[PDB]
Write a protein that binds this ligand. Structure first.
Ligand SMILES: [Zn+2]
Lengths: 93, 67, 85, 137, 51, 134, 55, 161
RNA sequence: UUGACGGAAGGGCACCACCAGGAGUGGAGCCUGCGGCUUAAUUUGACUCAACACGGGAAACCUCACCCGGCCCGGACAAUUGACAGAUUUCUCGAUUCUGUGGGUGGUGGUGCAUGGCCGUUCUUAGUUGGUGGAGCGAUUUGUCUGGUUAAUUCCGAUAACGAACGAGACUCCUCCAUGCUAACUAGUUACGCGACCGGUCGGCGUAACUUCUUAGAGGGACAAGUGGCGUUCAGCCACACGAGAUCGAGCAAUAACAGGUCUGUGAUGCCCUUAGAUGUCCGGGGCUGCACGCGCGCUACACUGAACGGAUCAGCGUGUCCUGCGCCGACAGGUGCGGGUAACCCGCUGAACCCCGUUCGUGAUAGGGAUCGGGGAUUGCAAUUAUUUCCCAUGAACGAGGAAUUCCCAGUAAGUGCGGGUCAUAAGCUCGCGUUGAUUAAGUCCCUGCCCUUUGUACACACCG
């Protein structure tokens, strides 16, 4: 349960670049990349968990951090969720 | 505990059987000969080899060595 | 006057770039001060070998040596360079 | 202050410092003990003259000491009962009040760099006592 | 603490490892036999906010 | 005309500055007979009592010591003074007078001219010290 | 008032306000030289950091 | 402003975390370590892999995803870190590459004697003076078995190891 | 036949064995760890070496896994949010929890007898294995041995074996010097001027010479080399001269084994179990500190070879964004302002302790011992009560070298002595290091206790836990 403003701020950042990182810290007040927006770090790791469970994102782990990558299924889903044309692409494409 | 390993003794015998004319009864002279005619990766091993060459050279002058 | 600080964890690669710095600057007719060798620093870490408490009190000692040399005139991986005035 | 025995030097300098009745000698010299690691007060009644003679002697040898240094100079072993003994610094107020007492005699002044050093007057007075102990030996 | 440690406390495996089917089988150890690019989202947020 | 010779105990490095002049022997500015340990006062006077004051009556010696303990500095001072006179008699006096000094100091105690390499051993885990165990 | 109560215990010191940067473990931690990793994970990454055994 | 004692440690902790992250990521890509060359201007990461075509994406997107993941994890500025995937030769002389080649034959379910003996000869023909493969664990049974495979000579003690 | 084992024989080695001795431990108090008791819980792992100051485990909360109370979902994926008031009524958020059926998830939950990885131990003992040749139908054997020697299956020698590999050694890091190089305003010396004091002192100030002291690079040096003696005059040993040394201290460490430790180090992990009235998770409070007791590592002692009081005088390892210097306040513990140091720069010439030199104390349970308690001052922190530590005053216990037993140790070693690191908001009676002072005895032996090897025996081979 996260606000719709914070729900799209995580996806826009995930779509602006091609990757998404987050330290496994459910008690971290603000995400280091989403510092201007009052987005709790728990919302970032829990919103990316819903994307992983639907084949949209693949994850990794380096001792405290997740490493999320937008797949071809996830790029098209965010393209419809953010109401974007087929013309835009992430920074990794 | 002054027993030489087979690495020291075997290398010393091959040096004599190939460079008997260059060696003598002086360690410091044989120490420089073995440094050139043999590529020894260590200096302590060279001093052990050259020191046993000097020992064997004192035996050759009195008779044949079984090795 | 420029002071060049050179800090590395391996003396061979640290003195390799140190000699090339002195030689590379001596051909330019620059009066340079010799390489001042700072006292080496050994980062001691004495840990317990076993991941439990059953080991026979066997500790393992680690070292991380940081050699420091400065050059006062008027790069290989593992060597840090920092110039001053 | 060298060329003579330093243990008889501080005893003769304290006698000169007591015969010259100008030292401060605070009121609590009868109640205080010179360190937290000490069990009893000094046996000698005139301990403030003995310490002042020894303090000005340390400033002759190593100037710019200060209160924190004289606290370390006069430190010692601290018995902790059934626990092992450690080093303990001396008294800070005793070291501070004995430094200000030497300054009233113009023998010690504030060092420009660090703490307090010896004055040309104090260096003269210490060398005079150093000559008396040499002739008396 | 166990009295007889070497005595296996199971009827499925002893203290000495015993292979299944003598090492033969797919997931077994092995028997002793003979075998040898257009604009990104940053630009889209400007084109939609300039009108 | 002066030499600077060092004498080394465990960690006591005493450097004697043997320089021509009168019979002056001082340690850190203090006279030789004024060092705090009076029990070891004769150990510091062995180079003078054996060689005689006439050999030291032409050179000033100013020893500077640092490191080690009280006893280590004693053996380092007497070693620096012993070798500083030998090194002085070698570069500014004839070699015959050097052997006349060395044979007196070596026959009495070799530690006046040769430092012993004994140092503290590293502590091993599982014990209170180097050798002892728990 | 759960937002003012969840994770409201002051954690600015002690063994609870710090953990291993490798496995989130709070025991056997090594705080020297800014390692901030438990004693069991340092032995694993000793060569990768640069700590070798000479004696 | 960080001291040199903590700086050289922080440089080693970064290389330790960077190497381990690439093991869990480039496992099926023949990853065999990295070389971090830090310069005062920028930092370049050299990835060593036996299959470089997989370290790079279909058009070079995975290499873009790794360099974008490293700049965000370690606070590197945009365009401040560069990753260069390299190809290591003589795969038989790489212990990490041969451990991956053996692991991908075990999960396929061939054997532990036919698989290790096959990977033991690939190392010997690659110019190695000696090899040693040890497979421990449980397989087809409750009890764990240790299958050791040696070839040539192996130095165990001393500094040359 | 090869292993394993033996309560069979022989041989050998090792201060985790002995001998000769040192310091002890066991006795006292106390600090801690483990049982046993008690307990809403007194989490739990480990129990001969190879459990018991161990899990780097010195637990105020957190840690935390235990106990009793209350929230929270952090319920992937295929309407609902918060909240003022007081002990129930309103307002607010807006598709983000929609309730169920699916069946994810997380554990300091079980299983170390399902495992990985590390580690301990066998054993840091010297052991282990190809090629070719030889013996045997063969498994296998020989090499890999009667003996001598060595720290060592280290070597010589004997020799159906010869030549080799791993281990040992070599190697790596260490300290011992080298007035010879390379260089040093983040190291110093010396000569100089300057200036304070009575030619001596000056870590009191200044930039020219150059590297002894300091730092650290390179290259040297030591190899039983030289001499004498003992020896298959071999392998080596012993004693000497020379010399900075005539066995220096770690690290690494084979074949192979344990039902050794660890699931409570891991987003190492199989399975089982618990899954929202939770074994998840958070926040309070308590516990792990609980005490008739039986033990294990330790500290302090039982003094005059000493306690005190005072004088004097010497370290090294190392750490520092927190380490700390000066001027003030206070009796101490503290406080306070101004400072320095991300460091060979500041702390810092690390003015350490023991020790040394005076001064009183005088078989004395005493100025030995400072345990147990009272009354106060401070510091750390959100908060110390079950006293966190610390200071001051007072209280002044057992303990007069310690039973049967038992531990460690051969030279800068034992022991004494203090320092630093780790733990650390507060922080050492622990441990890892460091220097300081500095010995007695021993250069030997299988007597004991431990393993190793050969021979021998076996109905054992899951291998005597047979
Ligand atoms: Zn960890």
């Amino acid at each position: 349960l996260m606000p719709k403003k914070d729900r799209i701020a995580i996806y826009e950042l995930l779509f602006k670049e091609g990757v998404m990182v987050a330290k496994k810290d459910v008690h971290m007040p603000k995400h280091p990349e989403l510092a201007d927006k009052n987005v709790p770090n728990l919302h970032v790791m829990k919103a990316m968990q819903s994307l992983k469970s639907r084949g949209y994102v693949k994850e990794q782990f380096a001792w405290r951090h997740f490493y999320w990558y937008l797949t071809n299924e996830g790029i098209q889903y965010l393209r419809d969720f953010l109401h974007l044309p087929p013309e835009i692409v992430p920074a990794t494409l | 505990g002054r027993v030489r390993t087979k690495t020291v003794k075997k290398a010393a015998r091959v040096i004599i059987e190939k460079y008997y004319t260059r060696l003598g009864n002086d360690f410091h002279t044989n120490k420089r000969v073995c440094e050139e005619i043999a590529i020894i990766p260590s200096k302590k091993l060279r001093n052990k080899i050259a020191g046993y060459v000097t020992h064997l050279m004192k035996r050759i002058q009195r008779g044949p060595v079984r090795g | 006057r420029i002071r060049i600080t050179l800090t590395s964890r391996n003396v061979k690669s640290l003195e390799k770039v140190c000699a090339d710095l002195i030689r590379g600057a001596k051909e330019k007719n620059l009066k340079v001060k010799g390489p001042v060798r700072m006292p080496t620093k050994t980062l001691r870490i004495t840990t317990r070998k076993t991941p439990c408490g059953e080991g026979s009190k066997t500790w393992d000692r680690f070292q991380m040596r940081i050699h420091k040399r400065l050059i006062d005139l008027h790069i290989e991986p593992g060597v840090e360079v920092e110039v001053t005035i | 202050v060298k060329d003579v025995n330093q243990q008889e030097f501080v005893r003769a300098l304290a006698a000169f410092l007591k015969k010259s009745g100008k030292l401060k000698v605070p009121e609590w010299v009868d109640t205080v003990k010179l360190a937290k690691h000490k069990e009893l007060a000094p046996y000698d009644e005139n301990w403030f003259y003995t310490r002042a003679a020894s303090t000005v002697r340390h400033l002759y040898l190593r100037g710019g000491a200060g209160v924190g240094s004289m606290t370390k100079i006069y430190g010692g072993r601290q018995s902790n009962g059934v626990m092992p003994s450690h080093f303990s610094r001396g008294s800070k107020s005793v070291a501070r009040k004995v430094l200000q007492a030497l300054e009233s005699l113009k023998m010690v002044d504030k060092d420009p760099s660090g703490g307090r050093k010896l004055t040309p007057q104090g260096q003269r007075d210490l060398d005079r006592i150093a000559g008396q102990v040499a002739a008396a030996s | 603490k166990r009295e007889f440690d070497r005595h296996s406390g199971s009827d499925r495996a002893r203290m000495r490892p015993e292979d299944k089917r003598g090492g033969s089988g797919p997931r077994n150890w092995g028997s002793i036999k003979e075998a040898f690019q257009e604009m990104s989202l940053d630009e889209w947020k400007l084109l939609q906010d300039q009108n | 005309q002066s030499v600077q010779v060092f004498g080394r105990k465990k960690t006591a490095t005493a450097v004697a500055h043997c320089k021509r002049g009168n019979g002056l022997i001082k340690v850190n500015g203090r006279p030789l007979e004024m060092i705090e340990p009076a029990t070891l006062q004769y150990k510091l006077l062995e180079p003078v009592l054996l060689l005689g004051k006439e050999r030291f009556a032409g050179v000033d010696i100013r020893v500077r010591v640092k490191g080690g303990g009280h006893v280590a500095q004693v053996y380092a001072i007497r070693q620096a003074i012993s070798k500083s006179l030998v090194a002085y008699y070698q570069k500014y006096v004839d070699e015959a007078s050097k052997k006349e000094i060395k044979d007196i100091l070596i026959q009495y105690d070799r530690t006046l001219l040769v430092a012993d390499p004994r140092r503290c051993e590293s502590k091993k885990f599982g014990g209170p010290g180097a050798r002892a165990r728990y | 008032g759960h937002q003012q109560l969840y994770w409201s215990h002051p954690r600015k010191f002690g063994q609870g306000s710090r953990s291993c940067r490798v496995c989130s473990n709070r025991h056997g931690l090594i705080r020297k030289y800014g390692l901030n990793m438990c004693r069991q994970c340092f032995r694993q990454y000793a060569k990768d950091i640069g700590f070798v055994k000479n004696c | 402003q960080i001291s040199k004692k903590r700086k050289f440690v922080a440089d080693g902790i970064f290389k330790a975390e960077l190497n381990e992250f690439l093991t869990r990521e480039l496992a099926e890509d023949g990853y065999s370590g990295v070389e971090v060359r830090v310069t005062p201007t920028r930092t370049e990461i050299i990835i060593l892999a036996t299959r470089t075509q997989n370290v790079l994406g279909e058009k070079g997107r995975r290499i873009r995803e790794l360099t974008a993941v490293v700049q965000k994890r370690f606070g590197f500025p945009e365009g401040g870190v560069e990753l260069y995937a390299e190809k290591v030769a003589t795969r038989g002389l790489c212990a990490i590459a041969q451990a991956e080649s053996l692991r991908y034959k075990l999960l396929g379910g061939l054997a532990v004697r036919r698989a290790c003996y096959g990977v033991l000869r690939f190392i010997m023909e690659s110019g190695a003076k000696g090899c040693e493969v040890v497979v421990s664990g449980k397989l087809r049974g409750q009890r764990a078995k240790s299958m050791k495979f040696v070839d040539g000579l192996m130095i165990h003690s001393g500094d040359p190891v």
